[PDB]
Design a protein around this ligand. Sequence first.
Ligand SMILES: Cc1cc2nc3c(=O)[nH]c(=O)nc-3n(C[C@H](O)[C@H](O)[C@H](O)COP(=O)(O)O)c2cc1C
Ligand SMILES: Cc1cc2nc3c(=O)[nH]c(=O)nc-3n(C[C@H](O)[C@H](O)[C@H](O)COP(=O)(O)O)c2cc1C
Lengths: 122, 122
Amino acid sequence: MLPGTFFEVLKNEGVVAIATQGEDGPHLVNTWNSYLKVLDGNRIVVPVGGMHKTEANVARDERVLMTLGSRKVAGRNGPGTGFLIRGSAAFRTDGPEFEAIARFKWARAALVITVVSAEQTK
Amino acid sequence: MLPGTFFEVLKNEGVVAIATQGEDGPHLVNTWNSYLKVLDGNRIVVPVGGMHKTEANVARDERVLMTLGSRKVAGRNGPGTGFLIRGSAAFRTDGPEFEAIARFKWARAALVITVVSAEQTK
Ligand SMILES: Cc1cc2nc3c(=O)[nH]c(=O)nc-3n(C[C@H](O)[C@H](O)[C@H](O)COP(=O)(O)O)c2cc1C
Ligand SMILES: Cc1cc2nc3c(=O)[nH]c(=O)nc-3n(C[C@H](O)[C@H](O)[C@H](O)COP(=O)(O)O)c2cc1C
């Protein structure tokens, strides 16, 4: 369901934000546009170095939100666009999904987000 | 408390993420690095066009999280850095805080975040 415009955004660098539900409010961490690996089946894979609090939150509630964008991709009303992604998260430490980001020597896991919806918010 | 590195990040364009506590999970919206207006007293102002769900969430829980960064500013161990900002939010439709972003004519309000902590996460 990820649209072409989303893939255009990925051709440009930027800060990706991933929100999870914490015990006393939301938690928010980041990665880079260039680090995302998209696999068939609506899967976005993120290389995990830290994200220990994020992983703990996902264990209690798999639902996460992700935003990303680029000023270099045209939006509906002018330069720049971005997306709000909603999906379920899981942490993999072996298999094809981990190998997808194993190139990062510091990776301890792969954060796999299965997309349920993708909205272009600009 | 906002460090020099944070201001260096603001010299570069990028996508800012703002997380709030929603009724059934977190909510996440965006703005641009270039749109942030920093005021004395640890205040970060954001021009508000939409953010209706965000405003509703802030009405129930004023605590918000904000992340931003830039690959153009050096981190501790390599290129690129960013920040996790924690603070309290308030929406203004008049007064000096609103006037700070009034140049954006599409702004129905100003999202004022009073920062409690700023952590460079890379
Ligand atoms: C621009 C930027 C990119 C980041 N990329 C990653 C990344 O790819 N993987 C990762 O584990 N942490 C990354 N981080 C650090 C996380 O945002 C987070 O601070 C750290 O993983 C701790 O996660 P936790 O608070 O869930 O324990 C990045 C931080 C910034 C500012
Ligand atoms: C790159 C990018 C920048 C944005 N900048 C703003 C902004 O400055 N002000 C604003 O009100 N919405 C901005 N938005 C839209 C918000 O993220 C959000 O979708 C919208 O305000 C609705 O908020 P709500 O979901 O809290 O109702 C931006 C979206 C993107 C992708």
